[PDB]
Structure 1
Amino acid sequence: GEDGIFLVLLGLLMALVSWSMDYVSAKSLQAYKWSYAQMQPSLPLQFLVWVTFPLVLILFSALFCHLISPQAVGSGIPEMKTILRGVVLKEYLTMKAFVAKVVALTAGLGSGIPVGKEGPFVHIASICAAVLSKFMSVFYYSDILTVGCAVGVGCCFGTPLGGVLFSIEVTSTYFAVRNYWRGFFAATFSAFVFRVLAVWNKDAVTITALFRTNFRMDFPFDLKELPAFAAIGICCGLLGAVFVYLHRQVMLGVRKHKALSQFLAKHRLLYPGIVTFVIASFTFPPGMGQFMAGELMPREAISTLFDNNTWVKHAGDPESLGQSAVWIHPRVNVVIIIFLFFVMKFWMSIVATTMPIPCGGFMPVFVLGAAFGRLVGEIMAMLFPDGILFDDIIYKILPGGYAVIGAAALTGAVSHTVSTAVICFELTGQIAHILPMMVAVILANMVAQSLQPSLYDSIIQVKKLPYLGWNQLSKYTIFVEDIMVRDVKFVSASYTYGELRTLLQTTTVKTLPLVDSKDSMILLGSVERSELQALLQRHLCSCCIDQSPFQLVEQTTLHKTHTLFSLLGLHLAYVTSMGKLRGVLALEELQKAIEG
């Protein structure tokens, strides 16, 4: 209701901020291409500007990463999926950090270097959600965490139901549908605002999602090349494994050597920019875009890449098409230019996400999948150059569907989900090839499930955050008798002023275990420290007893122990026998155990 109005103000602010970032991004970027062209074409000096623009943007981004952000380097979703798995970091929910990240993401988004977008944007959206939740509704915790994740991604791209499905469908175990309904309303009106502000101010036409891909939708598929999609299962799954292996091969390479650590404490800013420099050394278009078309910044790159005609036959014409004119070298076959383009993007994208940046994990993967798709579509167009006939309708084949299905497939492979296909077609604007793209997506997903772990789980693995569960453990003999902590704090009401002051001076935690007597040992409840503080001071100048909801039977199986703490989403365990409290089991202590 009016918590929906709370949420709609949230989406209103985020859409104003997104309009700001891509507005200034597009203006700066076209100003780059504008001044770059319009000074003069001299191959030493255009080389000079071709070096000096990415490095100055990376200097702004890396300075803002270093100096202003004390902890927000390498930000994204896996820390907050660790937060909803339990590890709360309220200091990492600092208001000062939000503005400290986002414009650097603008530097990342306004850059022609491949960055992600969504991940840390989801993170700061949930940050802003939590802070305005502190500010509004005075003007339930992991509920707010989960809804913040949902509102963040569905409010990112105006794609509501893929946002909320991507928030729930992996980054949880169970989920309450009330919050589904709430955050879905938030995501839908937030989706609404993103396009209409583009119409009240400076205009897109009416209602593209972003990418109207005008296909014929008349005899679309057909049913003869579908087993070729089987290849786009298996091969894609093949390549999918390679990223995680090499990501591990670089994350260890992040932290293997003491030399660069010493030099990082000595001088941190130099290393990213220079290797930015050297990948810029492979980007200059009359230098190297003669064979790759590297002067394709990714948004218009994928828009020209979803061109619904065969480029081998349009290699037959010198026609000024749209931006796809960049896809012609006059001597080299374009399968080769796509081949080298993708492989250089392969080793460029991992180094791009390597350096210390808040990185979303989706768009360069989308470009790479779409690249592989139009690759195989153009070569199957080469394999059957004819295409087909039918009854007063000559229908020859077309490669655009291959591009959009691969751009679904590979990010499904990275992300271990199904929501990539929904956001894929929800941004595509047509949903023709939906069942073949879903089958190939699930083929690659189960190959990935077979071979390699998740992206973000490997990320928190290298960052070493303790899982936060672990499941499917059939122990021979494992019992929590060697495990429980026998440290118990205790307060009595018949303790008077001095005893209760001593208990204040000995204890630190927010709420406290109550038993009757330490000899009886039986757990009774939990009490706030500060209420006792209140009673002492404001009597010197209403005794309510709340109940303990849980108890650990001391031979609980490790499957069910994991399951109980998972589905409660709770921290601690008071372990009794016969009611008499015997031990304390902590969440992190269970993780340190269940490491094996």
Structure 2
Amino acid sequence: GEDGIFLVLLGLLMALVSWSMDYVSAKSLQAYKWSYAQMQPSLPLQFLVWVTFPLVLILFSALFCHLISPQAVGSGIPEMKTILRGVVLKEYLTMKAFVAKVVALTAGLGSGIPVGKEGPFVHIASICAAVLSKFMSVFYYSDILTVGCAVGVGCCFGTPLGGVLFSIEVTSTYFAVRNYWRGFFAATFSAFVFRVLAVWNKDAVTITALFRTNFRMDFPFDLKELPAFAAIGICCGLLGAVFVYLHRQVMLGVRKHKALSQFLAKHRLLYPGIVTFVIASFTFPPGMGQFMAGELMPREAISTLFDNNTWVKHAGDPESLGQSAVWIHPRVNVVIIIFLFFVMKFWMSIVATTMPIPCGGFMPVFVLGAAFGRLVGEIMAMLFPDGILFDDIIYKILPGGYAVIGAAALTGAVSHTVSTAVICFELTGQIAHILPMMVAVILANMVAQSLQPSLYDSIIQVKKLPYLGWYTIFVEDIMVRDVKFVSASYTYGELRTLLQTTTVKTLPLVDSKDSMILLGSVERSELQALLQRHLCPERRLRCCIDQSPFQLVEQTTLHKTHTLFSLLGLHLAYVTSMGKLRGVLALEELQKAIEG
């Protein structure tokens, strides 16, 4: 209803902003390709531009990322998933930086450097949610955050149900069912709006998701290479685990040393782009895309990975097909260029997410997963090129399903989740390999549970951002040992002293100053309005207390005190004994306890 009006205005503006950003991204980067081709093939000058228009665009990006934004460098989802799990930072929830981030993200989005959209877009979507909530009540909190999360990811990719899942399944402990209905409503109306405008304005075809990967969908797998799918699970999780490890090996490499931070801060702004230099030194297409097919911006890259044809038998024919023509060097085998492509995008991608950019950890890992999938699909084409039979028709395999299941599996391994597979097929446009990708997602996730933590927990761990998860433990001396006193029986100056002596917003109220049994709470404005209604007749002059419930039992273990404030989601712990108040136990002290 009115809440539905809140959700639909949220989703409509969110879809407008997303359409605008990939509109600018597409036009900018096609102009990059345009000028790069059309000037002249000059080994000084095209190497000059193959460095420098990424280099202008990306020190331009980091310029906007760092100067205008006082704090919004390196933003994402884990800080706000910590916010909903307790640590509120209203200073980090500034309206002014939202607009300051997103255009920087557009310079991240129009780049050739593989970056992730999803994190900071979710962050600014929650910002938008809070802003419209601020506009509400002119015509609770973790609900707003959760709806913002779901709306953000589902309005990135037009994937409704996968987005509301990726809100729910990782960034929560318990969940209120109103907010899924809100998120489903808003998310599907958003993804509706996201696609229709790309036909009303500048045109997609009609109602594709993004991607139609027309497989044969008729005798697809078959069930003979099927346990080989088991193999295509396993090592993915292993490599995904390895990814986080070297990321931790560079999270240390974030700030292992201060002397190079000083040598940095001699001119601090300049940092990331130099390795952009060397990856440009590893990306130049008549330099190195001779061996790698470097002329692949990531969206068309994953589409050309998804081409429904066998490249062993397109090593059979040298026919210039569409963009898949870039997958040919005429001498050396294409499995080798896929191998080197994969590994160089890998030790490019760790640094690509390393640099001070607000970035999600999705887009490069799914590309590398898709690479791994099409590698092994083409070697399966190598091993049995004959194919198998059906009723007077010979059917041979096609590798794009292997690529799409791996492109689910690796980011499922990175983020310790499963809805990566749902948005995988819901982005794919066909649901052929659906049960193989969920089974392989299971296998990758259990291997990841076996070895390594998640991406974002390791991020907040090494960043030491305050949370944490869930012989001698003795827990009694944590409480805060002073609470104010109120009685309502008063004359003039006694009511004034109750106003003046106190500081905080709302007020706890006990039974008596001696018994100290807490009763309820008080607002100051009510007292002041009582003083108003008292004042109204003067110059020759002619709501019961809502109750605070509980007591903390003085030896409540860290796991179960953590569980206590988890279940409450509430402010304090008023500790009494025999009703006589003992103290107030708080949250950051429990964080200091869980440090041990």
Change (3 A) 1:497 1:417: farther
How big is the shift at 1:198? Answer: 0.8
Q: What is the aligned partner in structure 2 of residue 341 from structure 1?
A: 341
Change (3 A) 1:478 1:511: farther
Say whether the 8 Å CA contact 1:151–1:164 is kept in structure 2. yes
Change (3 A) 1:538 1:591: farther
1 CA distance for matches of 2:152 and 2:484? 41
Say whether the 8 Å CA contact 2:240–2:411 is kept in structure 1. no
Change (3 A) 1:460 1:571: farther
Query: How far does the alpha carbon of each residue in 1:200-231 deviate from its partner, in whole angstroms, 9 at most, with x for none?
Result: 11111111100100011111111111222222
Query: How far does the alpha carbon of each residue in 1:312-352 deviate from its partner, in whole angstroms, 9 at most, with x for none?
Result: 11012121211010001111111110111111111111111
How big is the shift at 1:560? Answer: 2.8
Query: Which piece of structure 1 moves more, 517-526 or 323-332?
Result: 517-526
Query: Which piece of structure 1 moves more, 80-89 or 131-140?
Result: 131-140
Task: Tell me the percent identity.
Answer: 100
How big is the shift at 1:392? Answer: 1.4
How big is the shift at 1:500? Answer: 5.1
2 CA distance for matches of 1:143 and 1:495? 41
Query: How far does the alpha carbon of each residue in 1:42-101 deviate from its partner, in whole angstroms, 9 at most, with x for none?
Result: 111111111111110112111101111011100100111011011112222222111100
How big is the shift at 1:185? Answer: 0.5
Query: How far does the alpha carbon of each residue in 1:370-393 deviate from its partner, in whole angstroms, 9 at most, with x for none?
Result: 000000000111111111122211
3-state SS of paired residue (2:522)? strand
Change (3 A) 1:538 1:361: farther
Change (3 A) 1:255 1:308: same
3-state SS of paired residue (2:253)? helix
Say whether the 8 Å CA contact 1:237–1:413 is kept in structure 2. yes
1 CA distance for matches of 2:585 and 2:330? 70
Query: How far does the alpha carbon of each residue in 1:433-484 deviate from its partner, in whole angstroms, 9 at most, with x for none?
Result: 11111111100001101111111111111221232442xxxxx553432222
Say whether the 8 Å CA contact 1:86–1:468 is kept in structure 2. no
Change (3 A) 1:8 1:387: same
2 CA distance for matches of 1:312 and 1:125? 45
1 CA distance for matches of 2:133 and 2:417? 30
Query: Which piece of structure 1 moves more, 371-380 or 357-366?
Result: 357-366
Q: What is the aligned partner in structure 1 of residue 585 from structure 2?
A: 585
Query: How far does the alpha carbon of each residue in 1:26-50 deviate from its partner, in whole angstroms, 9 at most, with x for none?
Result: 1111111111111101111111111
Change (3 A) 1:270 1:450: same
Query: Which piece of structure 1 moves more, 235-244 or 522-531?
Result: 522-531
Query: Which piece of structure 1 moves more, 546-555 or 185-194?
Result: 546-555
How big is the shift at 1:528? Answer: 2.5
2 CA distance for matches of 1:497 and 1:39? 84
How big is the shift at 1:508? Answer: 3.1
2 CA distance for matches of 1:493 and 1:108? 59
3-state SS of paired residue (1:525)? strand
How big is the shift at 1:282? Answer: 0.5
Q: What is the aligned partner in structure 1 of residue 545 from structure 2?
A: 545
How big is the shift at 1:512? Answer: 2.2
Say whether the 8 Å CA contact 2:481–2:584 is kept in structure 1. yes
Gaps of 5+ in 1: 471-475
How big is the shift at 1:491? Answer: 2.6
2 CA distance for matches of 1:114 and 1:335? 22
How big is the shift at 1:25? Answer: 1.1
Say whether the 8 Å CA contact 2:521–2:546 is kept in structure 1. yes
How big is the shift at 1:505? Answer: 5.0
TM-score by length of structure 2 reads: 0.96
Query: How far does the alpha carbon of each residue in 1:383-420 deviate from its partner, in whole angstroms, 9 at most, with x for none?
Result: 11111122211101111110000000000001111100
How big is the shift at 1:556? Answer: 2.8
Say whether the 8 Å CA contact 1:244–1:455 is kept in structure 2. yes
Query: How far does the alpha carbon of each residue in 1:215-263 deviate from its partner, in whole angstroms, 9 at most, with x for none?
Result: 1111111111122222222211211221121111111111122123324
How big is the shift at 1:496? Answer: 5.1
Say whether the 8 Å CA contact 1:490–1:512 is kept in structure 2. no
Say whether the 8 Å CA contact 1:173–1:567 is kept in structure 2. no
2 CA distance for matches of 1:14 and 1:555? 48
How big is the shift at 1:504? Answer: 4.9
Counterpart check, 1:194 vs 2:189: no
2 CA distance for matches of 1:89 and 1:530? 26
Query: How far does the alpha carbon of each residue in 1:2-33 deviate from its partner, in whole angstroms, 9 at most, with x for none?
Result: 21122111111111111111111111111111
Change (3 A) 1:493 1:428: same
Say whether the 8 Å CA contact 1:485–1:585 is kept in structure 2. yes
Change (3 A) 1:508 1:276: farther
1 CA distance for matches of 2:110 and 2:503? 47
2 CA distance for matches of 1:183 and 1:19? 20
1 CA distance for matches of 2:366 and 2:422? 13
Say whether the 8 Å CA contact 1:304–1:324 is kept in structure 2. yes
How big is the shift at 1:177? Answer: 1.0
3-state SS of paired residue (2:508)? strand
Query: Which piece of structure 1 moves more, 304-313 or 486-495?
Result: 486-495
2 CA distance for matches of 1:417 and 1:226? 23
Query: How far does the alpha carbon of each residue in 1:547-587 deviate from its partner, in whole angstroms, 9 at most, with x for none?
Result: 11332122334433222211222231111112221111111
Query: How far does the alpha carbon of each residue in 1:94-152 deviate from its partner, in whole angstroms, 9 at most, with x for none?
Result: 22111100011100010011000111101101101110111134222221121111222
Query: How far does the alpha carbon of each residue in 1:494-524 deviate from its partner, in whole angstroms, 9 at most, with x for none?
Result: 4555455555555433222211332111111
Say whether the 8 Å CA contact 2:511–2:519 is kept in structure 1. yes
Say whether the 8 Å CA contact 1:491–1:500 is kept in structure 2. no
Counterpart check, 1:529 vs 2:524: yes
Q: What is the aligned partner in structure 2 of residue 384 from structure 1?
A: 384
3-state SS of paired residue (1:389)? strand
Change (3 A) 1:258 1:5: same
3-state SS of paired residue (1:373)? helix
2 CA distance for matches of 1:264 and 1:538? 64
Say whether the 8 Å CA contact 1:304–1:323 is kept in structure 2. yes
2 CA distance for matches of 1:274 and 1:265? 15
Match of 1:490 among 478, 485, 488: 485
2 CA distance for matches of 1:212 and 1:204? 12
2 CA distance for matches of 1:68 and 1:465? 23
3-state SS of paired residue (2:271)? helix
Say whether the 8 Å CA contact 2:388–2:396 is kept in structure 1. yes
2 CA distance for matches of 1:329 and 1:181? 52
3-state SS of paired residue (2:272)? helix
Match of 2:495 among 500, 517, 523: 500
Say whether the 8 Å CA contact 2:416–2:448 is kept in structure 1. yes
1 CA distance for matches of 2:375 and 2:503? 62
Change (3 A) 1:452 1:538: farther
Query: Which piece of structure 1 moves more, 252-261 or 426-435?
Result: 252-261
Say whether the 8 Å CA contact 1:241–1:451 is kept in structure 2. yes
2 CA distance for matches of 1:244 and 1:191? 31
Say whether the 8 Å CA contact 2:414–2:455 is kept in structure 1. yes
3-state SS of paired residue (1:576)? strand
3-state SS of paired residue (2:394)? strand
2 CA distance for matches of 1:536 and 1:351? 63
Change (3 A) 1:177 1:266: same
1 CA distance for matches of 2:124 and 2:158? 17
Query: Which piece of structure 1 moves more, 461-470 or 329-338?
Result: 461-470
Match of 1:478 among 473, 482, 487: 473
